[PDB]
Amino acid sequence: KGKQYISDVTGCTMVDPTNGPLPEDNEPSAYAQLDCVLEALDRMDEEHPGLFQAASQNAMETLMVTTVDKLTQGRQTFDWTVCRNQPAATALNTTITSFRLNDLNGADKGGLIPFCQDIIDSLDRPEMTFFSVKNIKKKLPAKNRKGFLIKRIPMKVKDKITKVEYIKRALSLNTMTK
Amino acid sequence: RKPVGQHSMLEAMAHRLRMDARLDYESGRMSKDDFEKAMAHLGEI
Amino acid sequence: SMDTFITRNFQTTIIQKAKNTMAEFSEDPELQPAMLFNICVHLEVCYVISDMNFLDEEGKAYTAQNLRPQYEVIEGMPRTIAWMVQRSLAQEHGIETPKYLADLFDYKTKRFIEVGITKGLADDYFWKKKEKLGNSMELMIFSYNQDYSLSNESSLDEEGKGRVLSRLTELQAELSLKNLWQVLIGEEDVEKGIDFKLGQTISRLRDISVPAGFSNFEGMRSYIDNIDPKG
Amino acid sequence: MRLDNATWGRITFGPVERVRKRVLLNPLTKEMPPDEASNVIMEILFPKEAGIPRESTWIHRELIKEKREKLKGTMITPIVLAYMLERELVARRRFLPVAGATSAEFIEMLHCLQGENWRQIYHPGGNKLTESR
Amino acid sequence: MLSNCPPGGISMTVTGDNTKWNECLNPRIFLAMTERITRDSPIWFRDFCSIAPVLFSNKI
RNA sequence: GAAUGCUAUAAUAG
RNA sequence: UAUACCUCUGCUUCUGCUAUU
RNA sequence: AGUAGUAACAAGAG
């Protein structure tokens, strides 16, 4: 019953319930009114004086110190380069390696902030390039009858995706069952 | 403990081994024949 | 300007080593190039002392195929590499590590050397850096007005002492030639605010991530900050 | 050794009001912050890769010297030696239900000290601090 | 909260649970929450915090 | 007569 | 084609966040 | 068949 519109970024069918018509029944509603939230937050701020800025301070000071390796501790993360789940530590690596190809070396600086700058910047890239491995046959000498052996060697190949295709992947969520 | 540095991994490894060798020579752990190879191999980096 | 000046005088080795050293402390090489020159000079002065200084198998100094110098450069090398070298030497020879990072170290003397370039007086600047060290490193201070103030045990030879004074007032003339000497005279001071600017794409996404009855994000920001929704 | 050179009193049945308080799980040789401990551990095992000498180095000079001499004769992996020293320098301080016994050497035996409806007298071994007395 | 009850009155406890919690809570509200909380923070940090909710509001 | 605040691969909880 | 009555595999056939730390 | 239960296994692959 909220505001339905088309996203001019992705072309997706966006629905917005906020500041919507109040419910007429006890069925679940997402139609939360901003003013009522802001008032509730104000009341909280009054009864807990100067906590918001106190927390915002500590949070901000924490960010400055926070390194990138902080992202290498969270089970299975969605990897946009291969469009399947990978271990958190590898998901980061794959993103860092791919970011370098598009001239994004914020991760090298060590802190989380410059890496984060690269993430929101990467959305502005017209095409995003990333490595994806392909196998190659190669003759190798051996104590064989014919005197050789074929073995498959992997080699990184540069794949491209468009501005939108990358954005959607960035905004993507992989689904499972609990 | 987590090693810190925005410089190259190779750079770090080179210097440490260079130092180790220099000190190993002057101390008397490493020989001249070995120290020849040490600095020679490190030169190739 | 200072930006194009350093390209002519100094090599790209000295440039990038100083830029990295300056980057570690999180200060922009281009926005504060006066501080870059200081470190550049600090590095070039240091590298000239250990250019042709070597040691033989017997254990004596000579002027130079062969690889084992008399001095060990510490300034220019990244923090953790520089400290590793400083600790490694101290432990091997058997002396206490200085609390502050050194610039050079003599293999024959077996002591740490602290270098310092100063604008005004050389002798007075020796006593400024005698407060922190005391007797930790053998200081070797130099200034631009052709003045030297070394420690009592000065290993620096008179021939080598000249090369410092040459470059001290070779580039000093080059700074006055192009009328860029006046750039370093002024007091350059500014804090490096951590800015985080949003691009075009993400900004558009934020504008469409707005509750109903809002044109763009700017509208939402002001509304939340300004208006009071009591009752 | 603390369990071995101990003495057990009597078990007693009756109501025990347990209070949930933040207590030390394991007796430390010397207590330090994580960072101070980490640097002390570095000085023992990995002198070269220590970094900037902190004043903390001088404060625990005898501990480092002592430990470095004791662990000198060994063929155990340094990473194991690291975590062992960390275990007896870094404090393990966590919330537990206690009832009249906060001392670590008591806490380590908290399971045998009491329940909700019973209490067992237990005397640890070795030494006990005068401040805790 | 027990003892501070008015004498000669009734203190009651609603053993509660919220159904369709994740399904109903909207990112755009969480964006508002950050903007309110980061009132007196510098402009970069206000914008930093605002991204995570914004991304969720356009999630696929 | 107090403190010292953190970071697991299990399990539970939401 | 076929080798193959052979060879390889037994969470990988998408397993999240947070707290107890 | 059966296990099982809002969708699967009851072998998969070179």
Cα A63 → chain centroid: 18
Residue C210, in any domain of the structure: no
Angle, alpha carbons C192-C194-C198 (nearest 5°): 135
The DSSP secondary structure of D59-102, one letter per residue, reads HTHHHHHHHHHHTTS--S-HHHHHHHHHHTTS--EEEEEESS--
Secondary structure class of D122 (helix, strand, coil): strand
Pairwise CA distance, residues D16 & D29, whole Å? 32
Residue C134, in any domain of the structure: yes
- Residue C80: which region, alpha, beta or left (left: phi > 0; alpha: psi -120 to 50)? alpha
Pairwise CA distance, residues C128 & C145, whole Å? 18
Question: What would the two tokens of residue D52 be?
Answer: 């900037």
Q: Residue C175 in contact with residue C150, Cβ under 8 Å?
A: no
Residue B18 is classified by DSSP as H
Residues of B in contact with C88 (CB under 8 A): 19-20, 23
**In chain D, what are the helix, strand and coil shares in percent, each to the nearest 5?**
35, 20, 45
Distance C205 CA to G16 C1' (A): 24
Report helix angle C79-93 to B9-27, nearest 10: 10
Count other Cβ atoms within 10 Å, centred on residue C222: 11
CB-based burial label for D63 (10 Å; 0-12, 13-18, 19+):
middle
Q: How many residues would you count in chain D?
A: 133
What are the strands, taking DSSP E only, across chain B?
none
Residue D31 is classified by DSSP as -
In three-state form (DSSP H/G/I as H, E/B as E, the rest C), the secondary structure along A70-92 is HHCCCCEEEECCCCEEEEHHHHH
Q: Is the CB of D101 under 7 A from strand F?
A: no
Nearest CA in chain D to B20: D48
Tell me the sheet residues that pair with D130.
none
CB < 7 A from strand G, the residues are A 74-77, 84-85, 88, 174-178; D 94-95
Q: How many residues would you count in chain A?
A: 178
Count other Cβ atoms within 10 Å, centred on residue E40: 12
Question: What would the two tokens of residue D76 be?
Answer: 């155990």
Number of H helices, E strands in chain D: 6, 4
- Say if strands C138-143 and C111-118 run parallel, antiparallel, or are unpaired: parallel
Pairwise CA distance, residues E39 & A176, whole Å? 38
Please state whether at least 3 CB pairs lie below 8 Å between chains E and D: no
Pairwise CA distance, residues A23 & A1, whole Å? 9
Select from D133, B27, A163, D57 the least CA-distant residue to C91: B27
Residue C218, in any domain of the structure: no
The DSSP secondary structure of C162-231, one letter per residue, reads HHHHHHHTTHHHHHHHTT-THHHHS-------------HHHHHHHHTS--SS-SSHHHHHHHHHH-----
Q: How many residues would you count in chain E?
A: 60
In three-state form (DSSP H/G/I as H, E/B as E, the rest C), the secondary structure along A156-167 is EEEEEEEHHHHH
Check A120 against C194: CB less than 8 A apart: no
Question: What would the two tokens of residue E3 be?
Answer: 């003892």
Select from C145, C133, C65 the least CA-distant residue to C101: C133
Pairwise CA distance, residues D23 & C228, whole Å? 46
Q: Residue A81 in contact with residue A131, Cβ under 8 Å?
A: yes
Residues of C in contact with E28 (CB under 8 A): 209-211
Count other Cβ atoms within 10 Å, centred on residue D123: 13
Q: Is C48 annotated as a binding residue?
A: no
Question: What would the two tokens of residue C219 be?
Answer: 């509208």
Pairwise CA distance, residues C45 & C70, whole Å? 16
Pairwise CA distance, residues A117 & A121, whole Å? 6
Residue C207, in any domain of the structure: no
- Residue B5: which region, alpha, beta or left (left: phi > 0; alpha: psi -120 to 50)? left
Number of domains in chain C: 1
Q: How many residues would you count in chain C?
A: 231
Residues of A in contact with B6 (CB under 8 A): 108-110
Alpha-helical regions (H) of A22-123: 34-47, 52-65, 88-101, 112-122
Residues 6+ apart with CB under 8 A from D108: D2, D25, D26, D27
Residue A23 is classified by DSSP as P
Select from C65, C81, C64 the least CA-distant residue to C73: C81
Check C81 against B39: CB less than 8 A apart: no
Question: What would the two tokens of residue A78 be?
Answer: 């969605």
Check C209 against E47: CB less than 8 A apart: no
Residue C93, in any domain of the structure: yes
Residue C215, in any domain of the structure: no
Nucleotides of F under 7 A from a protein CB: 3-9
Distance A95 CA to G8 C1' (A): 33
Residue C201, in any domain of the structure: no
Q: Which residue pairs from A2-5 have beta carbons closer than 8 angstroms and sit at least 24 positions apart in sequence?
A: A2/A30, A2/A31, A2/C212, A3/C212, A5/C208
Select from A169, A66, A65, A63 the least CA-distant residue to A123: A169
Question: What would the two tokens of residue D71 be?
Answer: 């662990």
Amino acid at site C99: K
Angle, alpha carbons D90-D92-D95 (nearest 5°): 155
Check D52 against C84: CB less than 8 A apart: no
Angle, alpha carbons C48-C53-C58 (nearest 5°): 170
Pairwise CA distance, residues D11 & D112, whole Å? 10
Residue C70 is classified by DSSP as S
Q: Residue D1 in contact with residue D108, Cβ under 8 Å?
A: no
Question: What would the two tokens of residue C228 be?
Answer: 């009071």
In three-state form (DSSP H/G/I as H, E/B as E, the rest C), the secondary structure along C6-31 is HHHHCCHHHHHHHHHHHHHCCCCCCC
Residue A69 is classified by DSSP as G
Report helix angle E27-37 to A52-65, nearest 10: 100
Q: Residue A5 in contact with residue E58, Cβ under 8 Å?
A: no
Q: How many residues would you count in chain B?
A: 45
Pairwise CA distance, residues C47 & C127, whole Å? 24
Nearest CA in chain B to A69: B2
Residue A154 is classified by DSSP as E
* Residue E23 backbone dihedrals phi, psi, to 5 degrees: -70, -30
* Residue D24 backbone dihedrals phi, psi, to 5 degrees: -85, 130
Residue C58, in any domain of the structure: yes
Instruction: Give the C-alpha distances (Å, rounded to integers) separating E38 from A34, A61, A135, C186.
Output: 16, 13, 51, 38
- What residues make up the domain containing C2? 1-192
Pairwise CA distance, residues C185 & D52, whole Å? 33
Secondary structure class of E47 (helix, strand, coil): helix
Question: What would the two tokens of residue E27 be?
Answer: 């990112």
Q: Residue A63 in contact with residue E41, Cβ under 8 Å?
A: no
Resolution in units of Å:
2.9
